[PDB]
Design an enzyme around this catalytic site. Structure first.
Site, mmCIF file in Angstrom:
data_model
loop_
_atom_site.group_PDB
_atom_site.id
_atom_site.type_symbol
_atom_site.label_atom_id
_atom_site.label_comp_id
_atom_site.label_asym_id
_atom_site.label_seq_id
_atom_site.Cartn_x
_atom_site.Cartn_y
_atom_site.Cartn_z
ATOM 1 N N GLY A 1 56.662 52.343 33.246
ATOM 2 C CA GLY A 1 55.733 52.756 32.203
ATOM 3 C C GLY A 1 56.329 53.597 31.097
ATOM 4 O O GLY A 1 57.549 53.687 30.970
ATOM 5 N N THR A 2 55.459 54.169 30.248
ATOM 6 C CA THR A 2 55.906 54.990 29.121
ATOM 7 C C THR A 2 55.493 56.422 29.296
ATOM 8 O O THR A 2 54.392 56.697 29.788
ATOM 9 C CB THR A 2 55.481 54.392 27.759
ATOM 10 O OG1 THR A 2 54.091 54.623 27.540
ATOM 11 C CG2 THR A 2 55.797 52.913 27.640
ATOM 12 N N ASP B 1 64.583 56.387 44.663
ATOM 13 C CA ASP B 1 65.263 56.190 43.364
ATOM 14 C C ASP B 1 65.958 57.430 42.870
ATOM 15 O O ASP B 1 65.879 57.775 41.681
ATOM 16 C CB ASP B 1 64.306 55.621 42.305
ATOM 17 C CG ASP B 1 63.948 54.191 42.594
ATOM 18 O OD1 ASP B 1 64.809 53.303 42.359
ATOM 19 O OD2 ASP B 1 62.888 53.967 43.205
ATOM 20 N N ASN C 1 61.181 51.184 33.811
ATOM 21 C CA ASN C 1 60.663 50.020 34.538
ATOM 22 C C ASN C 1 59.194 50.139 34.967
ATOM 23 O O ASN C 1 58.581 49.122 35.282
ATOM 24 C CB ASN C 1 61.556 49.674 35.751
ATOM 25 C CG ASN C 1 62.917 49.126 35.374
ATOM 26 O OD1 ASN C 1 63.043 48.126 34.655
ATOM 27 N ND2 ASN C 1 63.971 49.754 35.871
HETATM 28 N N1 LIG Z 1 58.071 64.948 33.591
HETATM 29 C C1 LIG Z 1 58.776 64.626 32.443
HETATM 30 N N2 LIG Z 1 58.971 65.553 31.500
HETATM 31 C C2 LIG Z 1 59.638 65.311 30.379
HETATM 32 N N3 LIG Z 1 60.135 64.119 30.122
HETATM 33 C C3 LIG Z 1 59.979 63.128 31.013
HETATM 34 C C4 LIG Z 1 59.284 63.331 32.220
HETATM 35 N N4 LIG Z 1 59.296 62.150 32.903
HETATM 36 C C5 LIG Z 1 59.959 61.266 32.218
HETATM 37 N N5 LIG Z 1 60.379 61.833 31.041
HETATM 38 C C6 LIG Z 1 61.092 61.220 29.922
HETATM 39 O O1 LIG Z 1 60.780 59.823 29.794
HETATM 40 C C7 LIG Z 1 62.031 59.098 29.803
HETATM 41 C C8 LIG Z 1 61.838 57.786 30.559
HETATM 42 O O2 LIG Z 1 61.235 58.074 31.827
HETATM 43 P P1 LIG Z 1 61.059 56.908 32.907
HETATM 44 O O3 LIG Z 1 59.866 56.055 32.456
HETATM 45 O O4 LIG Z 1 60.872 57.537 34.297
HETATM 46 O O5 LIG Z 1 62.421 56.019 32.877
HETATM 47 P P2 LIG Z 1 63.862 56.073 33.606
HETATM 48 O O6 LIG Z 1 63.818 57.084 34.773
HETATM 49 O O7 LIG Z 1 64.947 56.437 32.577
HETATM 50 N N6 LIG Z 1 64.266 54.547 34.210
HETATM 51 P P3 LIG Z 1 63.286 53.857 35.422
HETATM 52 O O8 LIG Z 1 63.955 53.995 36.820
HETATM 53 O O9 LIG Z 1 63.261 52.325 35.103
HETATM 54 O O10 LIG Z 1 61.816 54.372 35.408
HETATM 55 C C9 LIG Z 1 63.039 60.019 30.531
HETATM 56 O O11 LIG Z 1 64.371 59.676 30.148
HETATM 57 C C10 LIG Z 1 62.628 61.402 29.987
HETATM 58 O O12 LIG Z 1 63.149 61.630 28.656
#
Ligand SMILES: Nc1ncnc2c1ncn2[C@@H]1O[C@H](COP(=O)(O)OP(=O)(O)NP(=O)(O)O)[C@@H](O)[C@H]1O
Ligand SMILES: [Mg+2]
Length: 538
Positions: free
Chosen positions: A299-300, A410, A297
């Site tokens: 970013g990427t 969260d 929600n």
């Molecule tokens: N610090 C990190 N290290 C490695 N992978 C990460 C890290 N942060 C996020 N990710 C990866 O990126 C994916 C998506 O992250 P994120 O954008 O935070 O979405 P989310 O937690 O699944 N849902 P949301 O609550 O909408 O943000 C995660 O499922 C991990 O695979």
């Protein structure tokens, strides 16, 4: 002390306590007392009821009194046992018949047992060069694994091992000073597994031979066989068997452990590394990979590399959405980013800094195994004890956030990321607040009054524990948010997941306390989890 109680066993394991209750016949209300496995000077009560063993941690209060789960205070563990023989006061049943230590079994509480806490502390300091909070945080999560590890260290470095001293030298060293019964040492008789155990008994030195058999095992003549001198000393410090008495005081002469990773300590733990003077990072020092790790929600996320003095640090970078570029959001985003950057604990995904480039970029520690819920759904062979270890680390990270007055908002399995199968880190703390923003994870006061606190993070933690024990299944399956709110108002809760321990489901229910005031904080949650974890994992 409880050594005078005939049903007190000292520092035995939970399984050994259950084996003794089975030995005693498993009759309803049959019980024994033992020491809490946490170095906190507490006790544990093990009771048979309905062909199952029930275990309860007895905590030492600040005034030296004792209680179970913040319950009523008792003067001593004997008094707690007496009270519980007349009134259950929350226990499964009344304490009916004690199971006394069998003939020849002494409480497992001698000097050998006492050395363990310091040995583990010294082992962490030496192996990983950890100090202060990094050191304390390593020990708290890894105490059971570290106790197993110290037991395999070379006998030659132990205080009771005197090496190649002669029989005459051992006799004189055992006799110097206060003649404490059970005072002892081990010396080598040759270089091929032959040893002597010298023990003080009523002012006289007894010299026992220790011999290595063809199968590599060590023993005294006609005694129990042991793989190591460590195990031999542990046994003889509470079961004299063939000795005239117990040993007491030594004579004076993807599966990596968290600490074995580069993200256990902060990237700036090395004093020669340059810590950024503010929240901003130099974009020129950052390289991103083309492919994304995922999106959400906010970013990427992409894998990246951050150039530092001694090394290139692998990082995860969250590229915020175009919505975050709105001038109205800027001050709060920067204010929250500064507070995120202050946080420093092994059980969180440390926020290294921010880049204001083509988009806002949050530079973080890399937790390459990804999110907990997806990992468990793909790896259903992960044991209940491994899940306990992981959720306990989450409760440590949250205890730190609460102490730092930082509300996550969260907390959920999607926001717990794995560095290794035995190392969890909390991610995305404060991001929803930073971006001026999930109802199944919200406490009732959040949905009703928009009151986010460390207590509402406790509620979320209960849902996270449920997700973890359900191997990443979704909570409140197929329910709308309105149906969830109505169900909770009725006092109804999600069920105990398949194979989830009853103490873990009781902790979930405690996190799901409707009233904010009565709901525990993270200090209480972590300690309750720690006590269970230490009692079940050996
Ligand atoms: N610090 C990190 N290290 C490695 N992978 C990460 C890290 N942060 C996020 N990710 C990866 O990126 C994916 C998506 O992250 P994120 O954008 O935070 O979405 P989310 O937690 O699944 N849902 P949301 O609550 O909408 O943000 C995660 O499922 C991990 O695979
Ligand atoms: Mg996330």
């Amino acid at each position: 002390s409880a050594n005078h109680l005939p049903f007190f066993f000292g520092n035995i394991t939970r399984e050994e306590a259950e084996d003794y209750l089975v030995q005693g016949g498993m009759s309803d209300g049959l019980y024994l007392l033992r020491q809490s496995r946490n170095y906190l000077g507490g006790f544990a009560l093990s009771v048979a009821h309905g062909r199952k063993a029930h275990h309860y941690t007895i905590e030492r209060e600040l005034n030296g009194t004792y209680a179970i789960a913040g319950g009523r205070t008792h003067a001593s563990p004997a008094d707690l046992c007496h009270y519980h023989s007349q009134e259950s006061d929350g226990l499964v049943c009344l304490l009916k018949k004690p199971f006394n230590r069998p003939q020849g079994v002494q409480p497992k509480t001698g000097p050998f047992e006492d050395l363990k806490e310091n040995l583990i502390r010294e082992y962490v300091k030496q192996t990983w060069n950890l100090q202060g909070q990094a050191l304390e945080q390593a020990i708290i999560s890894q105490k059971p694994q570290l106790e197993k590890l110290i037991a395999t260290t070379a006998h030659e470095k132990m205080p009771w091992f005197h090496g190649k001293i002669s029989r005459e030298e051992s006799e004189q060293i055992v006799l110097i000073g206060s003649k404490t019964n059970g005072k002892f040492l081990i010396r080598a008789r040759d270089n091929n597994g032959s040893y002597a155990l010298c023990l003080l008994h009523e002012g006289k030195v007894l010299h026992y031979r220790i011999d290595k058999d063809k199968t590599g095992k060590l023993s005294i003549p006609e005694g129990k066989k042991f793989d190591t001198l460590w195990q031999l000393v542990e046994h003889y410090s509470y079961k004299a068997d063939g000795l005239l008495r117990v040993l007491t005081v030594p004579c004076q002469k993807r599966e990596a452990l968290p600490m074995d990773t580069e993200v256990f300590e902060s990237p700036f733990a090395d004093p020669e590394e340059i810590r950024p003077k503010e929240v901003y990072l130099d974009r020129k020092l950052l390289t991103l990979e083309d492919k994304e790790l995922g999106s959400g929600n906010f970013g990427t996320v992409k894998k990246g590399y951050y150039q530092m003095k001694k090394v290139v640090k692998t990082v995860a970078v969250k590229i915020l959405k175009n919505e975050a570029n709105d001038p109205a959001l800027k001050d709060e985003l920067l204010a929250e980013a500064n507070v995120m950057q202050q946080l420093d604990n092994p059980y969180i995904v440390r926020m290294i800094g921010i880049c204001e480039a083509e988009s806002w970029m949050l530079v973080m520690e890399m937790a390459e195994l990804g999110p907990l819920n997806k990992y468990l759904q793909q790896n259903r062979h992960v044991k209940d004890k491994n899940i306990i270890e992981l959720v306990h680390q989450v409760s440590m990270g949250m205890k730190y956030l609460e102490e730092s007055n930082f509300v996550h908002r969260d907390l959920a399995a999607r926001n717990v990321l794995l560095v290794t199968q035995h190392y969890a880190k909390i991610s995305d703390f404060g991001l929803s607040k930073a971006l001026r923003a999930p109802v199944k994870w919200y406490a009732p006061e959040c949905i009703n009054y928009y009151k986010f606190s460390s207590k509402s993070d406790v509620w979320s933690f209960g849902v996270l524990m449920w997700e973890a024990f359900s191997y990443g299944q979704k909570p409140y399956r197929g329910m709308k948010g309105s149906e969830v709110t109505a169900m909770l108002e009725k006092g109804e809760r999600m069920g105990c997941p398949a194979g989830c321990p009853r103490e873990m489901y009781d902790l979930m229910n405690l996190c799901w306390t409707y009233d904010v005031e009565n709901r525990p904080g993270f200090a209480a949650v972590e300690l309750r989890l720690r006590n269970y974890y230490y009692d079940v994992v050996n």
